[PDB]
């Protein structure tokens, strides 16, 4: 399904960008930079980190508006695909 | 509603899995592991705890992407099939 | 509009219940108990408090499932009413 | 799209109001006040700061109820009117 495939690609690319940004500008380990990107765009949030640089705060504001809609579109399409085999078996 | 029953069971299994994961790998008490799993997948977040192990961080990323869709599908079906009909019935003057 | 009025009442009643619970079981000032109830059900979250009692953790789990749908229905209906005068003037 | 333009302006005014409020009453630097306003109204939350004054707590409660609806209305219109058409156009082989 192309719509799912394109949403996956867009999501991956968006998360790579955040991982690169937070590891190079905010000094996080790559796994922590990816984690922060994920919990930010899914709106879970993180209780133990917020960006410390003005550049990082501005980036994070724009990153949320650029990425939140795409990530929730991906989460929805992923849910359809993961749940369908159980629905159809049932 | 077969879809509701599926989302209910999958949500329960998802929360059981998180309870087992966070109590085993991150050392949380089971009630705290269940709490963390619920507030993470409903996107509330916990304001104090973050996974400390790299295993926990990777698991949580995958758990979020799969679990948010299931839990909010369940919450939507719960609203449509249970809560809204119950509110409507309870507003009828008798 | 009755649908808005009923959603308002349900939301108020739900927030009062949380305020009573967190102030009596978790020892919060009423304003902090109301604040915690609001940021929990809107999924904002709070970075500086989590329930400390097992009773409070169980309550919070059930409170989220009981209240999240109602609160977002109210937020949506509120948004229609607050935005409409500007839309119609424009 | 007149509705999009209205939601855009109202979102900007809402974020300006929060920036002014949190920098004045809660003592935050303006950039930190804007950051807090954005992560609160998108429901991400900030994992470190909570309003410390009772004024700030009451304001934040009201700001949340009014501002989440505006900001997510804007995000939805931004997705439908700007982001989706741009993605589609950028997928056309030329
Ligand atoms: K915190
Ligand atoms: K959230
Ligand atoms: K959150
Ligand atoms: Na949070
Ligand atoms: Na918390
Ligand atoms: Na944070």
Numbering used by the authors:
A (entry chain A), C (entry chain A): 21 to 110
B (entry chain B), D (entry chain B): 21 to 114
Give the exact sentences the study uses for this entry.
The sodium potassium ion channel (NaK) is a non­selective, monovalent cation channel that conducts both sodium and potassium ions equally efficiently. The SF of NaK (Thr-Val-Gly-Asp-Gly) differs by a single amino acid residue (Asp66) to the one found in potassium ion channels, yet NaK conducts both sodium and potassium ions. In a later study, it was found that the deletion of the first nineteen amino acid residues removed the interfacial helix of the protein, altering the conformation of the NaK channel and placing it in an ‘open’ form as the inner helices twist around a flexible glycine residue (Gly87). This deletion mutant is often named NaKΔ19.
Here, we were able to crystallize NaKΔ19 in the original space group of the full-length NaK, namely C2221. In this space group, two polypeptides or subunits are present within the asymmetric unit allowing differences between subunits to be observed. An added benefit of the space group C2221 is that merohedral twinning is not possible, removing additional complications from structural refinement. These crystals diffracted to a resolution of 1.53 Å producing the highest resolution structure of NaKΔ19 to date. During refinement, it became evident that the entire Asn68 residue in the A polypeptide was present in dual conformations and that the entire Asp66 residue in the B polypeptide was also present in dual conformations. The new structure reveals that K+ ions bind at sites 3 and 4, whereas the Na+ ion is found in the vestibule as well as at the side-entry binding site. Therefore, we conclude that the current crystal structure with only conformational asymmetry at the top part of the SF represents only the K+-conducting state that enables ion permeations from two different pathways.
